Amino acid sequence: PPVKESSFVEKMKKTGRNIIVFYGSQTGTAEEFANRLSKDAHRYGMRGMSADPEEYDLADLSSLPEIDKSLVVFCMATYPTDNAQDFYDWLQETDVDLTGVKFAVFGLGNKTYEHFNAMGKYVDQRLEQLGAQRIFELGLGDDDGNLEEDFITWREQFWPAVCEFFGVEATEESSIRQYELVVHEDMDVAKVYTGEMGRLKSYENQKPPFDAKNPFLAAVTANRKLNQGTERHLMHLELDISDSKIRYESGDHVAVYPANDSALVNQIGEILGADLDVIMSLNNLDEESNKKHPFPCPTTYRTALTYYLDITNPPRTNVLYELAQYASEPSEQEHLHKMASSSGEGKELYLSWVVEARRHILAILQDYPSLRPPIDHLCELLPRLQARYYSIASSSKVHPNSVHICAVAVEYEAKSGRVNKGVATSWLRAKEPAGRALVPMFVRKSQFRLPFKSTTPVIMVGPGTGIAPFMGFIQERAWLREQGKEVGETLLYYGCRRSDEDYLYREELARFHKDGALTQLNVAFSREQAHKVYVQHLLKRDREHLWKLIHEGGAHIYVCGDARNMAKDVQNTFYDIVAEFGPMEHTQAVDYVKKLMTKGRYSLDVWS
Ligand SMILES: Cc1cc2nc3c(=O)[nH]c(=O)nc-3n(C[C@H](O)[C@H](O)[C@H](O)COP(=O)(O)OP(=O)(O)OC[C@H]3O[C@@H](n4cnc5c(N)ncnc54)[C@H](O)[C@@H]3O)c2cc1C
Ligand SMILES: Cc1cc2nc3c(=O)[nH]c(=O)nc-3n(C[C@H](O)[C@H](O)[C@H](O)COP(=O)(O)O)c2cc1C
């Protein structure tokens, strides 16, 4: 387990802080919201700190009242995030009295998902049960609409509520730097970071175990085009994890740390008139903080912009707010300044011109030519470049030393006028098997798993790239049959546009079906006729048999792919099947299916 830092309350006392903001975050959204709230404190005569609850023992919350006008805020996203597990387990377990504790929670969720803001709601509810007093209403941010805006709305009401309760004054301050720039003219190249994530030279000198902090650089042994046509580009990659000691199972995910497009990095440097090869460090102006830098330093701006910073997603409102000061044309400074509005034209412009048009930082620098911020401050403002997850497309029973990836390359026309390229997929696509192509990765254990007993029936639904984990599932069920095991029915419900356009793993699937590994290979070709044909239309077609498998055969259902519409439509079709054959009313059919998920017989691996 992690070695906990010493009491966060004592740390707050020693540094004159009265507010602490904890972040439950997986892809850094809640973390950035916490950082923003922590920084806001200064604007109201207070002082805060942002913190990862995993590095602390939240039992010390009971000591928080020892600090006058103290308050704790929780920015929690749902998936309970890995870093919030300890805190979560603690909440359920303790009977500690948090009398005198003042709190507020802001949840990050997405309605297209089952348990919307479950974590956020739990924390807010539990702290009250334990005796603490809510200082502001629970926030319910929905990433399906616009999370940034929900945060803005909440934040705007939160602070005045806080000032009113503690009797503090709102004042309105000038720009404040979190880090100071230190340029290094003399530096042993052996101490300059070049893209590694953890220890310096950890990419060059690999040492297990390998994880998110110390990714394993896996060699790309294969990278082939899966689709037959040219409308899009879908690919299959095989990463060699030999000698990595990494363990995995069909259903797990593989994460990769990509590199941004070099041309995009070069242009940002060029438009800002900056020398990207300058070696430097951004050092926290708060020498007490454990966050010494915003990213591994010392390093060059080029390396930072390539491996450490997100330069492709639309900049958040606070970033544009802080950049406004560097736009010399009044109208541009005004537009940038107003992006953080909670209503009106400023808000509408942010939603349409930045978010909807998908303008990345370079696009904004190009379209607002008066905006010329210094490179070091920009690097301090940009979010960190995140790893991308993929559903491992292979079975470890068959490929113990290789992790396969099935992915669609992202490349689309943005309303901003440019063609936007997906970071990880463009980078993966360019990896050519060999001075060999290496991909920094690690595996994340999931709960998406084949049944324990070989005899249990399996129903897999995964159109498009949703086929990914099922290639592994099928490889494994085929292996079991080869091993003399008794394997129940294995049905695949797959979907693509046309058999001659993007039928992924066409030959492999035909083989598994021929050999009996697949009991049924049901494929919906959505564009081979005037009307759409989807996997759920095939599920409805086979309702009688599927009900038999589910109700009498104890079958396990698996859905993978599009979380936005496909997953929901498929779930609805299952409701209808249950409703008809139970038989039972729709409401009871829903409870039936929801119960299957709790009992591990209806699993999901969907993304958007
Ligand atoms: C658990 C999990 C499993 C996953 N499994 C797989 C998998 O097995 N195979 C796979 O291909 N992907 C999978 N993904 C998705 C994957 O992690 C990446 O999100 C995806 O590959 C795109 O990454 P990228 O870096 O190439 O694109 P990025 O640079 O990250 O850009 C992605 C963003 O581009 C924007 N965008 C995409 N198209 C448009 C458009 N047409 N118009 C406007 N905006 C658009 C959206 O905001 C999208 O979020 C999975 C994701 C999760 C979370
Ligand atoms: C695999 C996956 C599963 C998710 N499951 C849920 C969920 O059950 N409930 C919910 O409200 N949001 C869910 N979300 C949405 C996130 O909670 C939302 O995007 C949040 O903003 C992410 O914050 P982070 O970057 O700080 O982790 C999911 C997102 C992904 C990618």
Three-state SS sequence of 44-104:
HCCCEEEECHHHCCHHHHHHHHHCCCCEEEEEEECCCCHHHHHHHHHHHHCCCCCCCCEEE
Domain 3-173 bears CATH identifier 3.40.50.300: no
Which amino acid appears at position 158 of this protein?
A: F
Both tokens of 236, joined, read 């299959």
Query: Does the active-site annotation cover 370?
Result: no
Task: Find out whether 117 is annotated in a ligand binding site.
Answer: yes
Q: Is the minimum distance from the CB of 143 to ligand 2 under 6 angstroms?
A: yes
Cα dist. 364→171, 371, 374, 382, 492 in Å?
A: 31, 8, 15, 13, 45
Residues with Cβ within 8 Å of 171's Cβ and at least 6 positions away in sequence, in order, are 43
Q: How many whole angstroms separate alpha carbon 280 and alpha carbon 269? A: 15
Residue limits of CATH 3.40.50.360 in the chain: 3-173
Resolution in A: 2.0
Q: Does residue 312's CB lie within 6 angstroms of at least one atom of ligand 1?
A: yes
b (16+ CB within 10 A) / e for 251-271: bbbbbbbbbbbeebbeebbee
Rounded Cα gap, residues 350 and 317, in angstroms: 8
Distance CA 203, CA 193 (A): 10
- What is the C-alpha to C-alpha distance for residues 122 and 142, in angstroms, rounded to an integer? 16
Confirm or reject: Cβ of 389 under 6 Å from ligand 1.
yes
User: Which amino acid type is present at position 18?
Assistant: N
Residues just before a chain gap in the chain (C–N exceeding 2.5 Å) are 79, 171, 434
Please answer whether residues 404 and 238 qualify as being in contact, where contact means their C-beta atoms are separated by less than 8 angstroms: yes
* Nearest protein CA to atom 22 of ligand 2, as residue: 77
607 is known as an active-site residue: yes
What does the angle CA 326 – CA 331 – CA 332 come to, to the nearest 5 degrees? 40
Q: Which residue has a Cα nearest atom 13 of ligand 1?
A: 390
Ligand nearest to the CA of 310: 1
Cβ–ligand 1 distance for 408 under 6 Å, the answer: yes
DSSP state of 372: -
Give the C-alpha separation, 361 to 264, whole Å: 10
Contact status, residue 387 vs residue 257, Cβ threshold 8 Å = yes
Element (H, E) at 139: strand 139-142
If one residue of 108, 313, 568 were mutated to test the ligand 2 pocket, choosing by the most ligand atoms within 8 A of its CB, it would be: 108
Active-site residue flag, 605: yes
CB 446 within 8 A of CB 253: yes
CA-closest residue to ligand 2 atom 16? 109
Indicate whether residue 116 lines ligand 2 (CB < 6 A). yes
Catalytic residue among 281, 391, 395, 402: 391
Buried-state track 397-418, b at ≥16 Cβ within 10 A, e below 16? bebeebbbbbbbbeeeeeebee
- 3-state SS record for 272-289: CCCCCCCEEEEEECCCCC
CA distance 565 to 144: 12
Helix (H) or strand (E) holding 571: helix 566-581
Q: Which of 250, 446, 560, 562 is catalytic?
A: 560
Helix, strand or coil, per DSSP, at residue 516: coil
**CA dist list (Å): 331 to 173, 338, 347, 368:** 21, 11, 16, 9
Q: What is the position in ligand 2's atom list of the atom closest to the CA of 116?
A: 11
| HEC string for 318-337 | HHHHHHHHHECCHHHHHHHH
Element (H, E) at 155: helix 147-166
Record: fold of 259-384: NADPH-cytochrome p450 Reductase; Chain A, domain 3 (1.20.990)
* Chain region(s) in the chain for CATH 1.20.990.10: 259-384
For residue 104, report the phi and psi dihedrals to the nearest 5 degrees. -160, 145
For helices 118-129 and 85-93, give the axis angle rounded to 10 degrees.
Answer: 40
* Beta-carbon contacts of residue 108 (< 8 Å; ≥ 6 apart): 25, 29, 30, 33, 75, 76, 77, 78, 117, 120, 141, 143, 147
Residue written as tokens 């896996």? 218
Residues of the chain with CATH 3.40.50.80: 449-606
CA distances from 62 to 72, 83, 96 (A): 11, 21, 7
List beta partners, residue 524: 495
Amino acid (1-letter code) at residue 97: D
Question: d(Cα 91, Cα 81) in Å, to the nearest integer?
Answer: 14
List, in order, residues 6 or more apart from 411 with CB less than 8 Å away. Answer: 233, 419, 420, 421, 422, 426
Peptide bond connecting 209 to the previous residue in cis, omega within 30 degrees of 0: yes
By most ligand atoms within 8 Å of CB, the mutation choice from 405, 410, 412, 558 for ligand 1 is 410
Query: Which residue's CA is the nearest one to ligand 1's atom 4?
Result: 390
**Cβ(233)–Cβ(408) below 8 Å:** yes
Sheet order of strands, 279-284 included = 179-183, 279-284, 299-300
- Extract the tokens encoding 189: 């190249």
Residue spans in the chain of domains classed CATH 2.40.30.10: 205-258+385-448
How far apart are the C-alpha atoms of 117 and 97, rounded to whole Å? 25
CATH 3.30.1370.160 at 449-606, yes or no: no
**500 is an active site residue:** no
* Cα 341 off chain centre by: 26
92, burial (CB in 10 Å: exposed 0-12, middle 13-18, buried 19+): exposed
Atom of ligand 1 nearest to the CA of 405: 8
Q: Helix, strand, coil: what percent of the chain each, to 5?
A: 40, 20, 40
Q: Count Cβ atoms below 10 Å from residue 370 Cβ, excluding itself.
A: 14
Q: 602 a known binding residue? A: no
What is the DSSP secondary structure assignment for residue 17, as one 8-state letter? -
Local structure of 316: helix, strand or coil: coil
Ligand 1 centroid to residue 473 C-alpha, Å = 23
For 192-311, where are the alpha helices, taking DSSP H only?
262-271, 301-303
CATH number of 205-258+385-448: 2.40.30.10
